[PDB]
């Protein structure tokens, strides 16, 4: 009956591990090693001037994260000056960075996490997994699978939030390596991706640096501390409440074609604290699996109606050959809208999200038994809606559900 009771108060603030839509890529054409590959990165940019703070983190020492930035700039600066540019790189134990790795409250929806989905669904004009990187079969795949898997992988190999799943494989293998790798240093992590270009080119990709603490990870729930420092074009003035958790400076000026001839805009670094757990990081290297679920949601939706036309639909059902039309817009929507669904239960995964979904989906069953033949659950949904954006987006779209 009543529609969601979502809560009120100041906008809620981003809260993945690494940026999403806002994020900034220093790339190379054509290329191994992480930290080679981005000091490369580094050195393709030419705007890089005095850092200073434009946005300060209101409950952290912004200082520190201003000279942790320098830091990592200078000590870069040594390692091309060392003979061999070495596998990794350990931070000096400086005072700022032993600062910053560490040695009820309602928020209302804010509407950048829609834009944040929005941005998820969308193409990019780069393919981020390989033809074969769906599926842990053993055995050859059967025809229909086979071709299922290759209609699906063309509208989602592009897609961002495809990037956005091999983007968080790489930082949690990386920081889950280097956790017990090098569990005393303060090891500096480039946050690197890779690609390939419509024109078949390799590209690798720097969005910045993590910077962990010391990890001496005995639990899966133990948690390791690390420091985030990513580029960005985003003003962070724009949605200051978005930017609640992070410091952020002005680190450069980038040189950039736009529908306007070339036009300069600064570049920009979120800075913020951050921690994980090795449980997490070994979810953050399975994300690979969000490829396969939401396939596997396509698969049943063509299942449904190979039975019901006792004929496999599969060609019919990618091609758009019962139904007239596809309400997302086209088969290609369908897909990475239901791939950035779950890849973003990944990056925004909590309890609240847990509770909301298997209550909500008590309430839907019972909300369609009512609607085609015609108190305490609510209670159970609303405790989970607090403060987190994806919980609350969510919700959101519960309500829509519910005037429809
Ligand atoms: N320090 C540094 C290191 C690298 Cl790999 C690239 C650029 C700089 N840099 C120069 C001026 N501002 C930053
Ligand atoms: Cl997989």
Same mark, same amino acid.
């Given at each position: =009956?009543?529609?969601?009771?979502?809560?009120?108060? =100041?906008?809620? +603030? &981003?809260?993945?591990?690494?940026?999403?839509?806002?994020?900034? *890529?220093?790339?190379?054409?054509?290329?191994?090693?992480?930290?080679?590959?981005?000091?490369?990165?580094?050195?393709?940019?030419?705007?890089?001037?005095?850092?200073?703070?434009?946005?300060?983190?209101?409950?952290? $020492?912004?200082?520190?994260?201003?000279?942790?930035?320098?830091?990592?700039?200078?000590?870069?600066?040594?390692?091309?000056?060392?003979?061999? $540019?070495?596998?990794?790189?350990?931070?000096?134990?400086?005072?700022?960075?032993?600062?910053?790795?560490?040695? =009820?409250?309602?928020?209302?929806?804010?509407?950048?996490?829609?834009?944040?989905?929005?941005?998820?669904?969308?193409?990019?004009?780069?393919?981020? $997994?390989?033809?074969?990187? /769906?599926?842990?079969?053993?055995?050859?795949?059967?025809?229909?699978?086979?071709?299922?898997?290759?209609?699906?992988?063309?509208? #989602?190999?592009?897609?961002?939030? @495809?990037?956005?799943?091999?983007?968080?494989?790489? /930082?949690?293998?990386?920081?889950?390596?280097?956790?017990?790798?090098? !569990?005393?240093?303060?090891?500096? /992590?480039? !946050?690197? +991706?890779?690609?390939?270009?419509?024109?078949?080119?390799?590209?690798?990709?720097?969005?910045?640096?993590?910077?962990?603490?010391?990890?001496?990870?005995?639990?899966?729930?133990?948690?390791?501390?690390?420091?985030?420092?990513?580029?960005?074009?985003?003003?962070?003035?724009?949605? =200051?409440?978005?930017?609640?958790?992070?410091? #952020?400076?002005?680190?450069?000026?980038?040189?950039?074609?736009?529908?306007?001839?070339?036009?300069?805009?600064?570049?920009?670094?979120?800075?913020? @604290?951050?921690? @994980?757990?090795?449980?997490? !990081?070994?979810?953050? !290297?399975?994300?690979?699996?969000?490829?396969?679920?939401?396939? &596997?949601?396509?698969?049943?939706?063509?299942?449904?109606?190979?039975?019901?036309?006792?004929?496999?639909?599969?060609?019919?059902?990618?091609?758009?050959?019962?139904?007239?039309?596809?309400?997302?817009?086209?088969?290609?929507?369908?897909?990475?809208?239901?791939?950035? *669904?779950? #890849?973003?239960?990944?990056?925004?995964?909590?309890?609240?999200?847990?509770?909301?979904?298997?209550?909500?989906?008590?309430?839907?069953?019972?909300?369609?038994?009512?609607?085609?033949?015609?108190?305490?659950?609510?209670?159970?949904?609303?405790?989970?809606?607090?403060?987190?954006?994806?919980?609350?987006?969510?919700? +959101?779209?519960?309500?829509?559900?519910?005037?429809?």
């Amino acid at each position: =009956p009543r529609p969601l009771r979502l809560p009120d108060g =100041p906008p809620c +603030s &981003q809260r993945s591990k690494f940026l999403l839509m806002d994020a900034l *890529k220093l790339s190379i054409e054509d290329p191994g090693i992480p930290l080679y590959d981005a000091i490369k990165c580094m050195r393709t940019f030419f705007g890089w001037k005095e850092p200073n703070v434009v946005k300060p983190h209101e409950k952290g $020492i912004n200082p520190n994260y201003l000279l942790s930035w320098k830091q990592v700039l200078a000590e870069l600066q040594d390692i091309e000056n060392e003979e061999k $540019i070495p596998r990794t790189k350990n931070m000096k134990k400086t005072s700022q960075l032993k600062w910053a790795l560490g040695e =009820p409250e309602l928020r209302s929806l804010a509407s950048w996490i829609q834009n944040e989905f929005n941005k998820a669904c969308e193409l990019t004009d780069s393919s981020w $997994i390989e033809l074969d990187e /769906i599926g842990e079969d053993a055995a050859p795949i059967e025809h229909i699978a086979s071709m299922r898997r290759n209609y699906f992988t063309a509208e #989602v190999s592009h897609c961002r939030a @495809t990037e956005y799943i091999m983007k968080g494989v790489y /930082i949690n293998t990386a920081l889950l390596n280097a956790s017990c790798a090098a !569990m005393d240093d303060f090891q500096l /992590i480039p !946050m690197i +991706s890779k690609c390939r270009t419509k024109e078949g080119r390799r590209k690798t990709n720097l969005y910045g640096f993590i910077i962990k603490g010391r990890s001496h990870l005995r639990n899966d729930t133990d948690v390791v501390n690390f420091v985030s420092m990513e580029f960005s074009l985003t003003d962070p003035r724009l949605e =200051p409440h978005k930017w609640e958790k992070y410091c #952020v400076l002005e680190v450069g000026d980038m040189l950039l074609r736009s529908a306007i001839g070339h036009v300069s805009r600064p570049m920009f670094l979120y800075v913020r @604290t951050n921690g @994980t757990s090795k449980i997490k !990081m070994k979810w953050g !290297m399975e994300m690979r699996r969000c490829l396969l679920q939401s396939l &596997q949601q396509i698969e049943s939706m063509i299942e449904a109606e190979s039975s019901v036309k006792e004929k496999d639909m599969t060609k019919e059902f990618f091609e758009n050959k019962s139904p007239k039309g596809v309400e997302e817009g086209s088969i290609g929507k369908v897909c990475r809208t239901l791939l950035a *669904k779950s #890849v973003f239960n990944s990056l925004y995964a909590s309890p609240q999200l847990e509770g909301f979904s298997a209550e909500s989906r008590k309430l839907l069953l019972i909300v369609q038994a009512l609607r085609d033949n015609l108190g305490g659950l609510y209670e159970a949904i609303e405790e989970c809606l607090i403060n987190d954006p994806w919980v609350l987006l969510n919700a +959101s779209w519960f309500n829509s559900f519910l005037t429809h």
